[PDB]
Amino acid sequence: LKITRITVYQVDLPLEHPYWKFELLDATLVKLETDAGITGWGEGTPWGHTYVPAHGPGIRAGIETMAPFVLGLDPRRLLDVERAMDIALPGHLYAKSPIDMACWDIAGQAAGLPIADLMGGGSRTPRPIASSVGAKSVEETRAVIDRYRQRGYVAHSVKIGGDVERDIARIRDVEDIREPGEIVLYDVNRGWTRQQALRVMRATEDLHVMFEQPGETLDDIAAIRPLHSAPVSVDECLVTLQDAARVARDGLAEVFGIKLNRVGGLTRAARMRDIALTHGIDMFVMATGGSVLADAEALHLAATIPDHACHAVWACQDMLTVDIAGGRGPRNIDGHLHLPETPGLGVHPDEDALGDPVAVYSE
Amino acid sequence: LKITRITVYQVDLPLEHPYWKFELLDATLVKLETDAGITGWGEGTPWGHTYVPAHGPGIRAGIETMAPFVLGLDPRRLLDVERAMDIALPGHLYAKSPIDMACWDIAGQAAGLPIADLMGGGSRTPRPIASSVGAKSVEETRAVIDRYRQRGYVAHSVKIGGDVERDIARIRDVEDIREPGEIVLYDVNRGWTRQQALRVMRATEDLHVMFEQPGETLDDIAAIRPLHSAPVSVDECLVTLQDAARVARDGLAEVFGIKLNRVGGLTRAARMRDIALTHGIDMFVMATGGSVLADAEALHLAATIPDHACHAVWACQDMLTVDIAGGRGPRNIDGHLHLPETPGLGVHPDEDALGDPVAVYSE
Amino acid sequence: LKITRITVYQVDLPLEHPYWKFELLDATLVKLETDAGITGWGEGTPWGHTYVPAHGPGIRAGIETMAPFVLGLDPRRLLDVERAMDIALPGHLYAKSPIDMACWDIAGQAAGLPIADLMGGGSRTPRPIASSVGAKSVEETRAVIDRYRQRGYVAHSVKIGGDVERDIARIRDVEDIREPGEIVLYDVNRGWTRQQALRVMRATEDLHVMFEQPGETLDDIAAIRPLHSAPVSVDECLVTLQDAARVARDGLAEVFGIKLNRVGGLTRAARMRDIALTHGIDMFVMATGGSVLADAEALHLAATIPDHACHAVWACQDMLTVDIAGGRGPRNIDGHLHLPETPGLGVHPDEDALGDPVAVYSE
Amino acid sequence: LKITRITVYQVDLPLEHPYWKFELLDATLVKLETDAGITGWGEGTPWGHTYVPAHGPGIRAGIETMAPFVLGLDPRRLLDVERAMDIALPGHLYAKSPIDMACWDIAGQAAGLPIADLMGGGSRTPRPIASSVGAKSVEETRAVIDRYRQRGYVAHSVKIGGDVERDIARIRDVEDIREPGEIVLYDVNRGWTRQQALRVMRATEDLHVMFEQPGETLDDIAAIRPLHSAPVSVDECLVTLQDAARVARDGLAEVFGIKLNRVGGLTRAARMRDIALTHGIDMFVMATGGSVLADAEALHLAATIPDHACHAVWACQDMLTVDIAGGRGPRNIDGHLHLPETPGLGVHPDEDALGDPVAVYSE
Amino acid sequence: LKITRITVYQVDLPLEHPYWKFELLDATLVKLETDAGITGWGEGTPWGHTYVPAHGPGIRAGIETMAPFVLGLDPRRLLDVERAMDIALPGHLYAKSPIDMACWDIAGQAAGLPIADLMGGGSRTPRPIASSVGAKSVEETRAVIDRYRQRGYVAHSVKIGGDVERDIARIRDVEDIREPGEIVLYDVNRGWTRQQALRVMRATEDLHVMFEQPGETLDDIAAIRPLHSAPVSVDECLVTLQDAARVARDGLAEVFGIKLNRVGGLTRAARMRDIALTHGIDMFVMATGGSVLADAEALHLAATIPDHACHAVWACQDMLTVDIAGGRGPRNIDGHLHLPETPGLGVHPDEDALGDPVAVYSE
């Protein structure tokens, strides 16, 4: 078996609810072909080009340079694919993720196994979905949660940052209406200075709350680590396996917020899982952004984690106004994603919605 | 003096109150014989084969390999017995414990001294017994404590883990009905992730409570050490003397939860005592599981600790539906164990209840 | 697919050259059967019962307890097999290795892939074999190396320990006759005190030599780490993934000496590889002991390491006087092992040489 | 003043001496235009796409995303340009460098000052040039140095890696023919494992030699830091200011090997200079690769360093077979670069050699 | 059993070879009596009153205060004796040693066991004796060693300190005439400043030598620990078990130089042994000073150490011109002490040589 052709696609996935000027995701899809005629897909969709060092053009760019060295290889040999990509172009993990996704998918089907199972075996327990709650008054806030809670959602990610007085107020408000067994994570998105982080994280310890990325960098996360007692989840700065092992040996945070595109995809999120699980660290697993092909990938990973150790996943498809698989793939069935039983990724798109190839690489 | 024959027994000790499928303890008894005709007994009884790296078949197994090198030696020379077992088979301390128990017992009688006295001198202060409180509603909870409290029990081990919201609630409930001078330890049994540990241990600092094994491994215990202020007792991961000295030099926990079978028996629990006492660390001493021969061993050790530094012992015999000594040995006399005055262990079983030898090793 | 029957075998593999009273390896073979009728094998063979916490009876023992929970599962789901074994019986990795070996082998064939390839893709570069050089005068020493060097061997493991003056002399002698490009590792086998280690490791820095396990425990390895400059390879004390990540984050040693049975087999050696490779650490990969089924397993792992990062493997079959596969499996073809191209382990024994089953576990 | 148009160019600069398949540099040139009609240039030229996380297509890619936010700004306000690029697209410093180069150049001329002077004032002391010495026998080695030494070169960068025995030999050979006052740096380019690094760096301490990037990552550099005494220069892993301040506070290396494109250009190399100089750390300053516009930029920085603290620069133009400025700009005048006296960068190319614009961004 | 009377003696033991004004040891002997009429002896003999915080009058003083609380107790209960002495008078371990010696001796005989055996079992391997080599020219030096070497001595303690140039010279001289398998320790006796220690310890690493107490305090030993590679033995500053565990966890020295009177006698040297042995640390065991009752005590301890881990003992009796046991007790039989086979200490003095009681304490 061998890789015969990489074909690259570009799709604008518009958002159901635009914001403030954010309006649509630049999404890159990859499709590798094999001489056996077993085909696999991968998707790379940064949530914008401001949130993290990754952008649409930059992946599409990555593949151009990386393509010639990935063609020819055996797709079912992910350490060889990986070592070829790494040699070919160090770093740039957001560019290596969709290829790795595709490659797994091929090997999945070739072994006649769903990704999660081929990666060692995955759980069928329905996985909760993290909602999304943008800035809004204490009044408009409760609104989105109760509405979201009627739509079956049982896990929420409330966005905060900017203002200590206002942020403390927001956490205290949300923790005032939060029915028992309700999962809420307070996602800061680096929107806090050390001094701010320290302040609000301390202020709300008596509500026993969790925070994601309370600082610009893992070093800010670390500096203030010994200063407060709130469990911190380490997200945008959780990039390599060194960041991985360093958090856990040195007790710098308690939770990994994995995001597949960010960390370089399946094979290398696997190793962060291996570490987190031996050092007693809990995960949230979500694709960075994208269609259902993104949710599918994050689900195969969330599956390989025992359910006590995996708090919530995300469905970015419910955030989008377009659908590129006409219903196919793991969808929001009552606030939860159910692992697909189908060999490989278990969802391919129809090339009807992808537009013409933006580039092609063969042998 | 010399060891002439090791004889190995196997006994199912059923539980008074089974649970959820736990129902009986696989227990290994050892009986060494000497050319002077002075006989000693040892018992090895893991609480199951899931709680800790130890199992019935594995001890019985250990002895087979270890036997030929222990035969012949002088039972009263515990550093020689020990060094022979260690050379013979590194690690496997749960397998070395019953032999060490027996050997002490022989030397005890040969010196005409109860274990506790021969080990340096033991206290006659009646030692409190830790009860056992399984998962149950806040309602069924109070029930077991008041009932247990009528039966004279004055020290309780409340089991928690799994759920931060529910666990906080359980501690707050139990600390709501706890009459002054009542000893309660909250035993987690590793049933917490770092993130969970940190959360509940912080949440309940204003009740001044103690926790046992709040994490999978001493490293999880350590990582979160600087993050909260609750005194932690270090249990399943307290195995060697290196774990011993490392906790105490590096201030990783405040309490040793010794369990004799786990740590390799009397001689090597002694050294953890030596350390804890010079570094201001308090002990709970209990056999891992078993009949009265197990409680006896843990009592000889709890005795060698000054009473301010020894919070509670355990009587596993009150947990069992069978009795293999027809009343003999230290029993629950009003919530407390009284150190036996008899030379050696001060309780032998009657081989009536042990069944036929499962194996024998002579010269 | 599912596991239908575990069958356990016991074989005495005698040594070509006995020593001082070491004469034969107690070896445990396991054979799992599936309802698809796809069969896999695993082997567990400690080099004795003195070298490391592992012994024949103790594995055979482990399986008894562990068996009921492993039956029924899907062999191709190694994180599920693993989590079932771990829950079933914590620790005891030397007992979990042969089952994991077998399980991989089934999944290997079921995916129609040799182990090394299914684990991510393996190298075909012929791998050097570590010879073995027991204590002997400077004269009898050179003898074994030149003789061994004629037989095509190009990598040697010279055993030292006990005496600083004599050990320094031995290294200086061996480094005096060592033709360029010759790989020699000086294996101490914990046979040094801190004070001795420090002394000889310093004394021979100007020969640029490497040492394996220069101390009883990783803590002795660590204490003296900052005191000398010789690269140390971390072996018997390299057990869990915590030991793994702790060495590498804290720069305590530079080389992993993996031994499959010790660390718990393929799935969990994989993770040590993942770590070593991201933290710039080099490996030696060898089975702990055994027949060709042991060499095969270590080869599938040595294969998944890029060749600059894998110094040498071992063939224990050339050390044995019996052959349980009548020629089949990776053998010493001119000082080197060549990765087998066959699906799975790529070598099964003939049950002719294994004797009658020592125990059987079905459903 | 404001930025009116960014125009992007792409040029293949072939090498005078190709190697092993490396043959030409993919180089990106940028030209910003202002409403005052003051024009500036920047160049981004990774030495390939394998040496470091940077590639031609990836910069050209970066600008596309980054362009709209850089248009409009005042070029003379580098903290505003920078904060706009950073917000626009985090990380990707190799993409931000040429824009920053250009922007400085405009502000340079607008202030009527050469870059080095506007950045605080630059030295006129002729700066030595680092030669380049590829792998070759001890014989072909001496050849390149003496030949290079006749051509006036007085500073050499000898490439090593791969093999401890061969590398030690290479250093000892080169240090055998090295006339007093001759600057040689041994550049490893990450081509060493921890174990190898430690070995050769120790082996050659008595020659008092310096090494560049002896390991894959700053963590490998750090782990082995306390283990040897050779001064290490920190290169490919010297990326952000955190890497900057962390090396120096924690004494992890003694020398910064700045490379402008890598670190994000002038403004942010300036800060590494500020740090190195207050913590007693010495620099080598070179462009990553490129034409004379690259050498010019590195010279303006090497100038802002006092001459005792700046060991050597590099002229990549002497490595190239094409010339895109027909003689203009700082050239190799007898082994040394002389800081240009002209306002701004002090060298623009002629758009004759750049080919047609590969993209244009206006308002 | 119980203690009935403590009787205290004072004896001047003159030296065979006086020095420079040192001439005789002020020695305190203690004799406890029991109602069973089983009698035990202890001796406390600082080597002067300048070498260490201990002096004749100060022990005799200690007992006065400590006596009333030690009378009455059971001598065979050393943790009770110890806890009574500690409560009675904290610190002052040089005063608590002779009582502890005596007490062991009683319990020894009462158990019908020699000290070494009752403490867990002792080795019969003849133990080497450390000679003593005072300051002298390189010429007079060799003299004392060869003469001493004819008298059967095979282990020497060469005294150094004061002068780096002269000390380096002395080590190099002694290491020039030192026949293979000859044990020499270079004892500094704190006679070095940090700067001096560092200098000479580095200067002589290529002779692979060991040093005792190279500094005033364990902190000086520690400060310079990471700066050199010579194995250091930790002596006068090795006082409590905290010093004990702190050296070994933090890798501050490699060798314990136990001295019984200093550390508080048998029970508490035992614990330092327990620690040293689990952390791979080697011992020298000697009484601080005194007659054969001192050598006997140190031998019972040196015996409880496996012979690879015990480099040499000392016989202070060969240093004395008087003999208080008319030949009885472990004497220098050809450079070695042989463990006595007799119950208890296995040597009592005859009260003929002790003079009249200097004080008596009864009930």
PDB file of N, CA and C in Angstrom, chain D residues 127-180:
ATOM      1  N   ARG D 127      33.521  44.029  10.951  1.00  0.00           N
ATOM      2  CA  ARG D 127      33.016  42.837  11.622  1.00  0.00           C
ATOM      3  C   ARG D 127      33.506  41.581  10.871  1.00  0.00           C
ATOM      4  N   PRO D 128      34.072  40.590  11.585  1.00  0.00           N
ATOM      5  CA  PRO D 128      34.538  39.370  10.896  1.00  0.00           C
ATOM      6  C   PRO D 128      33.391  38.559  10.284  1.00  0.00           C
ATOM      7  N   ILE D 129      33.677  37.801   9.225  1.00  0.00           N
ATOM      8  CA  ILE D 129      32.664  36.958   8.591  1.00  0.00           C
ATOM      9  C   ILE D 129      32.899  35.490   8.898  1.00  0.00           C
ATOM     10  N   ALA D 130      31.838  34.806   9.315  1.00  0.00           N
ATOM     11  CA  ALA D 130      31.903  33.365   9.517  1.00  0.00           C
ATOM     12  C   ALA D 130      31.926  32.661   8.150  1.00  0.00           C
ATOM     13  N   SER D 131      32.966  31.870   7.898  1.00  0.00           N
ATOM     14  CA  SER D 131      33.004  31.018   6.711  1.00  0.00           C
ATOM     15  C   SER D 131      31.998  29.868   6.871  1.00  0.00           C
ATOM     16  N   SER D 132      32.051  28.886   5.978  1.00  0.00           N
ATOM     17  CA  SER D 132      31.209  27.704   6.108  1.00  0.00           C
ATOM     18  C   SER D 132      32.025  26.497   5.687  1.00  0.00           C
ATOM     19  N   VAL D 133      32.049  25.459   6.524  1.00  0.00           N
ATOM     20  CA  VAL D 133      32.861  24.261   6.262  1.00  0.00           C
ATOM     21  C   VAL D 133      32.021  22.955   6.359  1.00  0.00           C
ATOM     22  N   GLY D 134      31.593  22.428   5.208  1.00  0.00           N
ATOM     23  CA  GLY D 134      30.764  21.216   5.157  1.00  0.00           C
ATOM     24  C   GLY D 134      31.562  19.966   5.480  1.00  0.00           C
ATOM     25  N   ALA D 135      30.867  18.866   5.782  1.00  0.00           N
ATOM     26  CA  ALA D 135      31.520  17.567   6.035  1.00  0.00           C
ATOM     27  C   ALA D 135      32.524  17.181   4.932  1.00  0.00           C
ATOM     28  N   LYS D 136      33.622  16.558   5.355  1.00  0.00           N
ATOM     29  CA  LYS D 136      34.767  16.260   4.490  1.00  0.00           C
ATOM     30  C   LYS D 136      35.843  15.568   5.329  1.00  0.00           C
ATOM     31  N   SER D 137      36.697  14.770   4.688  1.00  0.00           N
ATOM     32  CA  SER D 137      37.776  14.087   5.414  1.00  0.00           C
ATOM     33  C   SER D 137      38.727  15.109   6.054  1.00  0.00           C
ATOM     34  N   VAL D 138      39.396  14.699   7.134  1.00  0.00           N
ATOM     35  CA  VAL D 138      40.400  15.529   7.809  1.00  0.00           C
ATOM     36  C   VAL D 138      41.315  16.220   6.799  1.00  0.00           C
ATOM     37  N   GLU D 139      41.494  15.577   5.643  1.00  0.00           N
ATOM     38  CA  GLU D 139      42.325  16.094   4.551  1.00  0.00           C
ATOM     39  C   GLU D 139      41.622  17.211   3.755  1.00  0.00           C
ATOM     40  N   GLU D 140      40.413  16.928   3.255  1.00  0.00           N
ATOM     41  CA  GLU D 140      39.629  17.904   2.479  1.00  0.00           C
ATOM     42  C   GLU D 140      39.200  19.073   3.357  1.00  0.00           C
ATOM     43  N   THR D 141      39.166  18.823   4.667  1.00  0.00           N
ATOM     44  CA  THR D 141      38.864  19.825   5.691  1.00  0.00           C
ATOM     45  C   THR D 141      39.902  20.948   5.666  1.00  0.00           C
ATOM     46  N   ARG D 142      41.125  20.648   6.112  1.00  0.00           N
ATOM     47  CA  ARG D 142      42.233  21.614   6.108  1.00  0.00           C
ATOM     48  C   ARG D 142      42.249  22.442   4.824  1.00  0.00           C
ATOM     49  N   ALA D 143      41.927  21.783   3.711  1.00  0.00           N
ATOM     50  CA  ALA D 143      41.891  22.412   2.401  1.00  0.00           C
ATOM     51  C   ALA D 143      40.998  23.654   2.394  1.00  0.00           C
ATOM     52  N   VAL D 144      39.729  23.480   2.767  1.00  0.00           N
ATOM     53  CA  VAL D 144      38.733  24.564   2.759  1.00  0.00           C
ATOM     54  C   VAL D 144      39.107  25.720   3.710  1.00  0.00           C
ATOM     55  N   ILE D 145      39.769  25.395   4.820  1.00  0.00           N
ATOM     56  CA  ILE D 145      40.158  26.407   5.807  1.00  0.00           C
ATOM     57  C   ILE D 145      41.325  27.277   5.318  1.00  0.00           C
ATOM     58  N   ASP D 146      42.419  26.645   4.863  1.00  0.00           N
ATOM     59  CA  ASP D 146      43.607  27.366   4.337  1.00  0.00           C
ATOM     60  C   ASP D 146      43.270  28.202   3.088  1.00  0.00           C
ATOM     61  N   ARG D 147      42.525  27.605   2.150  1.00  0.00           N
ATOM     62  CA  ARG D 147      41.984  28.304   0.971  1.00  0.00           C
ATOM     63  C   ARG D 147      41.143  29.514   1.394  1.00  0.00           C
ATOM     64  N   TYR D 148      40.129  29.252   2.224  1.00  0.00           N
ATOM     65  CA  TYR D 148      39.308  30.286   2.872  1.00  0.00           C
ATOM     66  C   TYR D 148      40.160  31.334   3.624  1.00  0.00           C
ATOM     67  N   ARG D 149      41.235  30.887   4.284  1.00  0.00           N
ATOM     68  CA  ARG D 149      42.126  31.775   5.058  1.00  0.00           C
ATOM     69  C   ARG D 149      42.981  32.692   4.171  1.00  0.00           C
ATOM     70  N   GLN D 150      43.312  32.211   2.972  1.00  0.00           N
ATOM     71  CA  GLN D 150      43.995  33.015   1.949  1.00  0.00           C
ATOM     72  C   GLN D 150      43.052  34.105   1.419  1.00  0.00           C
ATOM     73  N   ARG D 151      41.792  33.733   1.160  1.00  0.00           N
ATOM     74  CA  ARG D 151      40.750  34.688   0.749  1.00  0.00           C
ATOM     75  C   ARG D 151      40.361  35.701   1.854  1.00  0.00           C
ATOM     76  N   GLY D 152      41.186  35.777   2.898  1.00  0.00           N
ATOM     77  CA  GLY D 152      41.064  36.806   3.935  1.00  0.00           C
ATOM     78  C   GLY D 152      40.200  36.466   5.141  1.00  0.00           C
ATOM     79  N   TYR D 153      39.470  35.346   5.056  1.00  0.00           N
ATOM     80  CA  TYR D 153      38.561  34.879   6.113  1.00  0.00           C
ATOM     81  C   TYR D 153      39.315  34.554   7.395  1.00  0.00           C
ATOM     82  N   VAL D 154      38.774  35.010   8.524  1.00  0.00           N
ATOM     83  CA  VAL D 154      39.467  34.926   9.813  1.00  0.00           C
ATOM     84  C   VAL D 154      38.547  34.343  10.913  1.00  0.00           C
ATOM     85  N   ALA D 155      37.359  33.916  10.486  1.00  0.00           N
ATOM     86  CA  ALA D 155      36.382  33.264  11.355  1.00  0.00           C
ATOM     87  C   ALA D 155      35.686  32.155  10.571  1.00  0.00           C
ATOM     88  N   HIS D 156      35.677  30.940  11.138  1.00  0.00           N
ATOM     89  CA  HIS D 156      35.118  29.748  10.475  1.00  0.00           C
ATOM     90  C   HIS D 156      34.071  29.006  11.292  1.00  0.00           C
ATOM     91  N   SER D 157      33.024  28.545  10.623  1.00  0.00           N
ATOM     92  CA  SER D 157      32.017  27.707  11.261  1.00  0.00           C
ATOM     93  C   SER D 157      32.109  26.277  10.727  1.00  0.00           C
ATOM     94  N   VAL D 158      32.733  25.400  11.502  1.00  0.00           N
ATOM     95  CA  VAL D 158      32.930  24.012  11.097  1.00  0.00           C
ATOM     96  C   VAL D 158      31.710  23.167  11.475  1.00  0.00           C
ATOM     97  N   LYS D 159      31.070  22.532  10.489  1.00  0.00           N
ATOM     98  CA  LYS D 159      29.872  21.710  10.764  1.00  0.00           C
ATOM     99  C   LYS D 159      30.220  20.291  11.242  1.00  0.00           C
ATOM    100  N   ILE D 160      29.583  19.892  12.338  1.00  0.00           N
ATOM    101  CA  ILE D 160      29.716  18.556  12.918  1.00  0.00           C
ATOM    102  C   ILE D 160      28.351  17.991  13.337  1.00  0.00           C
ATOM    103  N   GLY D 161      28.348  16.756  13.832  1.00  0.00           N
ATOM    104  CA  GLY D 161      27.129  16.045  14.193  1.00  0.00           C
ATOM    105  C   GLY D 161      27.205  14.600  13.748  1.00  0.00           C
ATOM    106  N   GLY D 162      26.223  13.798  14.144  1.00  0.00           N
ATOM    107  CA  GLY D 162      26.157  12.405  13.719  1.00  0.00           C
ATOM    108  C   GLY D 162      26.971  11.395  14.520  1.00  0.00           C
ATOM    109  N   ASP D 163      28.283  11.606  14.640  1.00  0.00           N
ATOM    110  CA  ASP D 163      29.183  10.554  15.156  1.00  0.00           C
ATOM    111  C   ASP D 163      30.192  11.025  16.204  1.00  0.00           C
ATOM    112  N   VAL D 164      30.107  10.492  17.419  1.00  0.00           N
ATOM    113  CA  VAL D 164      30.979  11.015  18.464  1.00  0.00           C
ATOM    114  C   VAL D 164      32.453  10.804  18.122  1.00  0.00           C
ATOM    115  N   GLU D 165      32.838   9.587  17.749  1.00  0.00           N
ATOM    116  CA  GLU D 165      34.243   9.314  17.427  1.00  0.00           C
ATOM    117  C   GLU D 165      34.765  10.224  16.313  1.00  0.00           C
ATOM    118  N   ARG D 166      34.017  10.312  15.206  1.00  0.00           N
ATOM    119  CA  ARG D 166      34.395  11.167  14.070  1.00  0.00           C
ATOM    120  C   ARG D 166      34.389  12.677  14.410  1.00  0.00           C
ATOM    121  N   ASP D 167      33.379  13.135  15.152  1.00  0.00           N
ATOM    122  CA  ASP D 167      33.284  14.537  15.566  1.00  0.00           C
ATOM    123  C   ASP D 167      34.427  14.976  16.471  1.00  0.00           C
ATOM    124  N   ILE D 168      34.791  14.146  17.444  1.00  0.00           N
ATOM    125  CA  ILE D 168      35.917  14.469  18.325  1.00  0.00           C
ATOM    126  C   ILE D 168      37.171  14.653  17.480  1.00  0.00           C
ATOM    127  N   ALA D 169      37.384  13.699  16.568  1.00  0.00           N
ATOM    128  CA  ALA D 169      38.491  13.711  15.609  1.00  0.00           C
ATOM    129  C   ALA D 169      38.531  14.994  14.768  1.00  0.00           C
ATOM    130  N   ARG D 170      37.370  15.420  14.260  1.00  0.00           N
ATOM    131  CA  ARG D 170      37.247  16.652  13.465  1.00  0.00           C
ATOM    132  C   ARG D 170      37.624  17.922  14.243  1.00  0.00           C
ATOM    133  N   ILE D 171      37.160  18.028  15.487  1.00  0.00           N
ATOM    134  CA  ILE D 171      37.492  19.169  16.339  1.00  0.00           C
ATOM    135  C   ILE D 171      38.990  19.192  16.649  1.00  0.00           C
ATOM    136  N   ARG D 172      39.544  18.027  16.946  1.00  0.00           N
ATOM    137  CA  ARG D 172      40.951  17.910  17.300  1.00  0.00           C
ATOM    138  C   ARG D 172      41.875  18.206  16.108  1.00  0.00           C
ATOM    139  N   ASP D 173      41.421  17.828  14.917  1.00  0.00           N
ATOM    140  CA  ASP D 173      42.110  18.146  13.681  1.00  0.00           C
ATOM    141  C   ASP D 173      42.130  19.652  13.393  1.00  0.00           C
ATOM    142  N   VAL D 174      40.944  20.275  13.422  1.00  0.00           N
ATOM    143  CA  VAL D 174      40.772  21.720  13.182  1.00  0.00           C
ATOM    144  C   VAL D 174      41.468  22.567  14.244  1.00  0.00           C
ATOM    145  N   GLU D 175      41.461  22.102  15.485  1.00  0.00           N
ATOM    146  CA  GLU D 175      42.156  22.816  16.544  1.00  0.00           C
ATOM    147  C   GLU D 175      43.655  22.574  16.492  1.00  0.00           C
ATOM    148  N   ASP D 176      44.084  21.662  15.623  1.00  0.00           N
ATOM    149  CA  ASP D 176      45.506  21.418  15.430  1.00  0.00           C
ATOM    150  C   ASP D 176      46.165  22.399  14.451  1.00  0.00           C
ATOM    151  N   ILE D 177      45.372  23.005  13.558  1.00  0.00           N
ATOM    152  CA  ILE D 177      45.896  23.907  12.507  1.00  0.00           C
ATOM    153  C   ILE D 177      45.429  25.365  12.596  1.00  0.00           C
ATOM    154  N   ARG D 178      44.957  25.765  13.770  1.00  0.00           N
ATOM    155  CA  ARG D 178      44.167  26.984  13.936  1.00  0.00           C
ATOM    156  C   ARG D 178      45.070  28.085  14.465  1.00  0.00           C
ATOM    157  N   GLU D 179      45.476  28.999  13.585  1.00  0.00           N
ATOM    158  CA  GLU D 179      46.447  30.044  13.964  1.00  0.00           C
ATOM    159  C   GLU D 179      45.854  30.986  15.015  1.00  0.00           C
ATOM    160  N   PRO D 180      46.672  31.384  16.020  1.00  0.00           N
ATOM    161  CA  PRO D 180      46.220  32.253  17.121  1.00  0.00           C
ATOM    162  C   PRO D 180      45.353  33.409  16.653  1.00  0.00           C
TER     163      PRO D 180
END
